[PDB]
Amino acid sequence: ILNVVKENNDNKWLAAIGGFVADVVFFQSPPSSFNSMGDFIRMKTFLFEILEASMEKNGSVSMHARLLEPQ
Amino acid sequence: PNNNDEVMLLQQKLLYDEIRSELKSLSQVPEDEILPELKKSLEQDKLSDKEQQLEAELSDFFRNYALLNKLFDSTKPYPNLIPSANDKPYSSQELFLRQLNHSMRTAKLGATISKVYYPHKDIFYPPLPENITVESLMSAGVHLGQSTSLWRSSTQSYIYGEYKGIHIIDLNQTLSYLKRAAKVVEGVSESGGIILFLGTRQGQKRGLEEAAKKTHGYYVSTRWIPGTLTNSTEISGIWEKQEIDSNDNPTERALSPNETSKQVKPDLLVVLNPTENRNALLEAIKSRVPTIAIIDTDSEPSLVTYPIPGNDDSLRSVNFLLGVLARAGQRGLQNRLARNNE
Amino acid sequence: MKIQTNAVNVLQRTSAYLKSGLLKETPAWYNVVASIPPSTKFTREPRFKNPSNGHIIGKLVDVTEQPHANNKGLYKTRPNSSDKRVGVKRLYRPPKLTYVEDRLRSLFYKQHPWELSRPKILVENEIGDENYDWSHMLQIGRPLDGESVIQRTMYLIKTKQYGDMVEAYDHARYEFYALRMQEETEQQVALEEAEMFGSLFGVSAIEHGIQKEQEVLDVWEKKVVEETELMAARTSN
Amino acid sequence: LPRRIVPKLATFYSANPNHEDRINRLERLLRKYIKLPSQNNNEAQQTKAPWISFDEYALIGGGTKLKPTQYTQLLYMLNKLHNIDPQLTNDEITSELSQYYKKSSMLSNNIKIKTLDEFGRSIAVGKRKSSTAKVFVVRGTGEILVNGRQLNDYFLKMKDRESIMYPLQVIESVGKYNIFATTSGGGPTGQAESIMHAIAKALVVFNPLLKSRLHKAGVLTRDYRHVERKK
Amino acid sequence: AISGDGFTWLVARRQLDKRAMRNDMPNRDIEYDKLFILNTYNAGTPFNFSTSGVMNELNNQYTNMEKQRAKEAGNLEDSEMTAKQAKTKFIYETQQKGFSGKEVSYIPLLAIDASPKTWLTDYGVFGKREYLERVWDSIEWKIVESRLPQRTKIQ
Amino acid sequence: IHVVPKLPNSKALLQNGVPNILSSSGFKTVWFDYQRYLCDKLTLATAGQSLESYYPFHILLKTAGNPLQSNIFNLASSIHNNHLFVENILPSAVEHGTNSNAVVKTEPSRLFLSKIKDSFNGSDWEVVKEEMIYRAENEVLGQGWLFLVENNEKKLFILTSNNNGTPYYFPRNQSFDLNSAISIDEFATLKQMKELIGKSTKLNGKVQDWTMPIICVNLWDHAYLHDYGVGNRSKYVKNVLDNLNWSVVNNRIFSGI
Ligand SMILES: [Mg+2]
């Protein structure tokens, strides 16, 4: 997870998965490690689920993920 | 079938280790424990006719090969391997030799490789000048000249065209110039002349050393001392010269101090990177030494007797052209040594 | 730099030394150089054709060869200013080599940017050994890549199966997609089949990236902390 | 039949033909035996590297022409060949390396193992300033005599007494030895520290494995400081 | 792509991941969400209900057995064996879950044999693709359509 | 380009096959056709890449640890294994084409029969062959390979692989078929192997394995079907193990001279 606050104006955070920047949708709540870590959240590795992958006309890949949290 | 032979040795080798191990055990025991008890036994024993045989046979056997002998004088592969016990696992050294055995036999099973370029073969298996094609020269990158911005327009006649911001050297001319240069090397080698290979760009040493070795020539890979030819007595007089016969074998004749100070001038100079060796080229001109050099698009052709148009920046291109010249020299040397035999 | 004279005339200067007697003994190279004379002309040579596209260099189209009107509707009755300028320089300037394939190569990699990410080896093996039949795209000895498409397109236009270059190019592109899809499946399936028989792998590509990112993110953590403490002290001023 | 004079070395025209020829010979060996593994005792830091001095190599490596970096290059290749595993080495490598080993075979060492005497005593001498001390260390119960007198009588300063005890305190053997120290010259400090130095040197015979700890504590180093005539 | 023995299956995911009263209504339970292609190797089955979780189940036995031997030894757990086994178990589970529940089954509709036994005798070493081309031109799609479940029109 | 190696006495092999094991048609399938099939696919997979200049054995080692190069690994492993099998079942490794030699009586060496007794609790070679035939029939449901291997501890043991499983590198032996059910003991072996691969510090996650094959038997349908038929692979393995070329098998055991 790159940012500790959802992308401004967007309801989704950003993740760095496999050399691509994806939009991560959380189940309901954001794990508490976010507030705790803060701006160092990128220092930790989380598990994600890749929902879909799309291709835009600019030649980018629109990867949508889901922050699988231990439960 | 004959394994027992080796087994017989190993048996002795094991026994030898046992004898040595317990020789060291008795070296720790105090003499007071053994000596007096041992002497007492002899004081309580009586020598027999046979016992006496060894009383003097061993005295001489120890007075001949231990005392009155000359302490000095006026399995071939890996002979220092310490084999491990048949129950113990392989040692690190044995695993290395076990892998080497696999590498020779099994490691190359399954397929052979064809039409693949191996860099070392340019130096060790150079082609003959007559078998060189434009394709071969092009495969080595000899056609790739300098940036058109760095053009020395005196090379115009060697240029085939410009492509991707560089000048393309005409390989048809490179081949003709290379063949002419190769014949010169062969001639000088067959005549017994001194051929010096000069190249001071990083990585050229390996090619330069092998070229000199197979032509019985000389090379310089580090630095051309300015004055090596024009100021030879102040630079090279101290180094040793030698006399050789027509077979290039040292005659062993001691040389008079007069003969050991005389300038020894190369009969032919080959320069891999002439743009960085202006000093050597000018000395060659001053000393009337014919020269061969690879001439790139930014290099001056008239500074050398026999130019070879070609890329001088790639080690593959240089080593390809050097290899051809080196083999040409080798053939000249072999033809000179053959005419001496017959 | 001046055209040098003394490098190519070593034989003649040496011959004067020998004839006069200044040099007693003939050098070993002397006979060899005499039999193989150096080239000593060092001239600039004209060229009348571009070897790449066969364009003729040095030809002037006379007004008699342009009898019909031009795109503007006007006839040409006299030489223009360009026709009256001497063009000797064009004879001596190294011709710019051009190839139609270069245009297609740029197109292919503009349409398929990620083909650039497939590493290419520029080191040649032996150009003379290439025995390729471009009736098919796959060839023994070379990879499947953009060049396979370009050479296939040229064969189609050369055999006149297609007339327009675009149509031949599109035909080759689909052949390329089919081969790329069969290889993407052979690799996925091979991995799947191996794991099903007990193959174990230490580090995956995704794992390799995570480890490398951690190494960088650890150094970045230290510096951030250090530079967020110098700022606090410097700002306190 | 016809004879001619040619340069002896292939590197004749180089800056240092003698050094380059020797380097080439070593490089050939390192190429021919590139596969041979290296010693794993190198991690154990085997204490063997008797290579000739820069000046000695200058006799054979070009004399004045020899440059320090050229000597450094020779050592990097001599060590690499030397560090090949002893079991897997061959004669060729050893033959080439023999010419570079510092010659110290005709001569021998001057050190004989120290041992306890007929009465179990370790005798060592120490010096500090102008003072000297000869101590007799034997296994005992911590009894000390200085010139036949009690320690508290001869040395009034407790810091001098503590200096004498320090070597025994390092090996934690204060109550395991009887010391009979004899000292002369200088003053109380020189004598107390000269005894300290002599006890440390005498304790190594009882257990040579503790020499490293004694050296690290600094009791085996002879203090060189003495009164200097003003200059 | 299959190197040795195996089968390429045309399957239909069963939209009955509820597990409640499962396999009680030959129509309400025979409903297919989406079709898929699946490869099985050697004697592998395309159903996935009788074999999903096998490794997770065996993994949990191994950890418990190792944890009980550790207790006999008397060890204070570990720094990352409880966090590594947990992650291994959490991934094993999340990768076998269904859209709603964790009962994902598949209905065989078609199967192509990849074993060399089938095609080596008639087509040779180089004719597997020729075999697969003639297989496609030899499929009676009536039998496949018959096996097809009824679509789950929850949409 | 990877080319099919030339085999000794190839004219005889193309006329009378391999006596007592394969016919002429059977040998054309296993070697002249399948080896060509593998080498061509390997060349297409590796041409234009650094792997093109490496022999198949080195390719499999280089690619053994790379999940997405498994296709290249399978081709390299199969190519190496097939020439290991064709080499120890070959009438004569030396080319007696102009010598017309018809007397090749090769028998197990003393070192081989000494290591067999040491590693198999005194079992004879004949008994070990029966265990090898049994292991092949019960552990290799489909395609695979049967090996007699030697490890770093001088012990000969039997390894079976599924499809193209290398004997050299235990993480890729493919000795357990996970399509079917596995016992807790087999899962323990897999779990222990995974732990060893995780102890390696290398960024390539590779371990050291010094196992080497001694005998190779091809259990693929390309080797037996045409001559034996479905279900008769145990009669094929029996013939192979009874007609091995022991000049090659003996040379594969390290002696140390
Ligand atoms: Mg250049």
Kindly write down the DSSP assignment for every residue of E67-125, as one continuous string.
Answer: HHHHHHHT----SSHHHHHHHHHHHHHHTT--SSSS---B---EEEE--HHHHHHHH-T
Residue pairs spanning E and F at CB distance below 8 A: 68
Measured between alpha carbons, how far is E23 from D127 in angstroms, rounded to an integer? 101
Contact B292, B284 (CB under 8 A): no
Q: Do C213 and A40 touch (CB under 8 A)?
A: no
Chains in contact with C, where contact requires at least 3 CB pairs less than 8 Å apart: A, B, E, F
C210 touches A at CB < 8 Å: yes
Contacts of F68 in chain C (CB under 8 A): 187, 191, 205
Rg of chain F over Cα atoms, rounded to whole angstroms, equals 19
DSSP state of F29: I
User: Strand pairing partners for B219?
Assistant: B197
Torsion angle of C-alpha atoms D22, D28, D34, D35, degrees rounded to 10: -120
Instruction: Please give the helix or strand (H or E) that residue C182 lies within, else none.
Output: helix C165-196
Strand pairing class (D144-146; B112-113): unpaired
Closest to C29 (Cα-Cα) out of B214, B229, B194, B333: B194
At residue A51, the 3 state secondary structure works out as strand
CA of B299 to the centre of ligand 1 (A): 8
Lateral strand order in the sheet of B166-169: B144-147, B166-169, B159-163
Choose from A47, A66, A69 for mutation: most chain E CBs within 10 A.
A47
Per the listing, tokens 């280089």 go with F62
Interchain proximity C189–E2, CB inside 8 Å: yes
What lies within 8 Å, CB to CB, of C18 at 6+ separation is C26, C30
- Are chains E and B touching, using the cut-off of 8 Å on CB pairs and a minimum of 3 such pairs? no
Gaps in chain A (C–N > 2.5 Å) come after which residues? Answer: none
Size of interface A-E (CB pairs under 8 A): 10
Cβ of A55 under 8 Å from any chain C Cβ?
no
Joined tokens for residue D199:
């006890």
**Which residue of B291, B300, B306 is in closest CB contact with C1?**
B300
CB contact under 8 A, C194 and F205: no
The bridge status of strand D4-7 relative to strand B241-244 is antiparallel
> In chain E, which residues have their Cβ closer than 8 Å to the Cβ of A68?
94
Element (H or E) spanning A50, and its range?
strand A47-55
Return the closest-CA partner of residue D203 out of D140, D154, D109.
D140
Nearest CA distance, B203 vs chain C (angstrom)? 18
Contact A61, A53 (CB under 8 A): yes
Distance of CA F35 to the CA centre of its chain: 14
Q: Does A2 touch chain E (CB under 8 A)?
A: no
- Note whether B242 contacts D8, CB cutoff 8 Å: yes
Do residue F187 and residue E117 have CB atoms under 8 angstroms apart? no
Question: Which among F128, F229, A49, B299 has a CA at the least distance from the CA of C7?
Answer: B299
Question: C-alpha distances in angstroms, F115 versus B1, B140, D197?
Answer: 16, 52, 63
- Residue D94 at interface with chain B, using a CB cutoff of 8 Å: no
Contacts of F179 in chain E (CB under 8 A): 40-44
Other CB atoms within a 10 A radius of the CB of residue E24 amount to 9
- Are D6 and B194 inside 8 Å of each other by CB? yes
Alpha-carbon gap, residue F116 to F241, rounded angstroms: 15
Tell me which residues of chain D, numbers 28 to 47, contact chain B at a CB-CB cutoff of 8 Å. Answer: 35, 37, 40
Residues with CB under 5 A from ligand 1 (ion): B 296, 312-313
* Whether E and A touch (3+ CB pairs < 8 Å), yes or no: yes
Which residue, B196, B292, B189, is CA-closest to D10? B196
**Which residue of B1, B89, B110 is in closest CB contact with F82?**
B110
Tokens (6 digits) for A71: 């439960």
Separation between Cα atoms, residue D182 and residue D194, nearest integer Å: 10
Question: Please, which residues 4-63 of chain C have a Cβ atom closer than 8 Å to chain F?
Answer: none
Segment holding A63, helix H or strand E = strand A61-68
Q: Chain C: residue nearest F160 by CA? A: C197
Q: What is the C-alpha separation between F97 and F78, in angstroms, rounded?
A: 28
Task: Determine contact: F192 vs chain C, CB below 8 A.
Answer: no
- Among candidates A31, A12, A13, which has minimal Cα distance to A69? A31
DSSP code at position B223: -
Closest Cβ opposite residue C124 in set B139, B153, B167:
B139
E71's tokens? 């207790």
The token pair at D180 is 């009979």
| Helices (H), ranges, chain F | 10-16, 24-27, 34-46, 56-63, 70-88, 110-119, 125-139, 184-199, 221-224, 233-242, 246-251
User: Which residues of chain A neighbour E91 with C-beta distances below 8 Å?
Assistant: 47
Q: Do the Cβ atoms of C28 and B301 come within 8 Å?
A: no
- Cα-based distances in Å from B242 to B265, D62, D86: 14, 18, 38
Distance, in Å, from the CA atom of F38 to the CA atom of F45, rounded to the nearest integer, reads: 10
Q: Where are the alpha helices (DSSP H) in chain A?
A: 33-37
Which of C43, A19, F125 minimizes the C-alpha distance to B302? Answer: C43
Residues in chain C with CB shorter than 8 Å from the CB of F207 are: 202
Q: Which residues in chain F (191-220) have CB-CB distances under 8 A to chain E?
A: 191, 220
Report which of E107, E99, E105, E103 is spatially closest to residue E17, judged by C-alpha positions. E103
Residue entry with tokens 């015979």:
D205
Chains F and B touch (3+ CB pairs under 8 A): yes
Contact (Cβ atoms closer than 8 angstroms) between residue B127 and residue B136: yes
Residue F181, C-beta contacts closer than 8 angstroms, at least 6 positions apart: E54
Measure F218 CA to nearest chain C CA, in Å.
17
Instruction: Please enumerate, as own/partner, the contacts of C153-162 that have beta carbons within 8 Å and a separation of 24 or more.
Output: C153/C104, C154/C100, C154/C101
Answer yes or no: do F57 and B106 touch at CB < 8 A: yes
Angle at B236 between CA B233 and CA B238, to 5 degrees: 90
Bridge partner residues of A16 (DSSP) = A21
d(CA D133, CA D190): 9
Nearest to C126 among B117, B141, B187 (CB): B117
**Single-letter code of the amino acid located at D195:** I
Comparing CB atoms, the residue among C7, C42, C94 nearest residue B162 is C94
Helix locations, D83-187, DSSP H = 91-98, 151-154, 158-170
CA distance F10 to chain B (A): 16
**What's the token pair of residue B194?**
């001194």
- Give the Å distances, CA to CA, from C74 to C62, C64, C81, C215: 16, 14, 17, 73
Q: Beta-carbon neighbour count of residue A58 at 10 Å?
A: 5
Q: Which amino acid is at B280?
A: A
Could you tell me the sign of the dihedral formed by the alpha carbons of B76, B77, B79, B83, in that order?
negative
What spacing in Å lies between the alpha carbon of B214 and ligand 1's midpoint? Answer: 27
Contacts of C11 in chain B (CB under 8 A): 290
Neighbours of C220 (CB within 10 A): 13
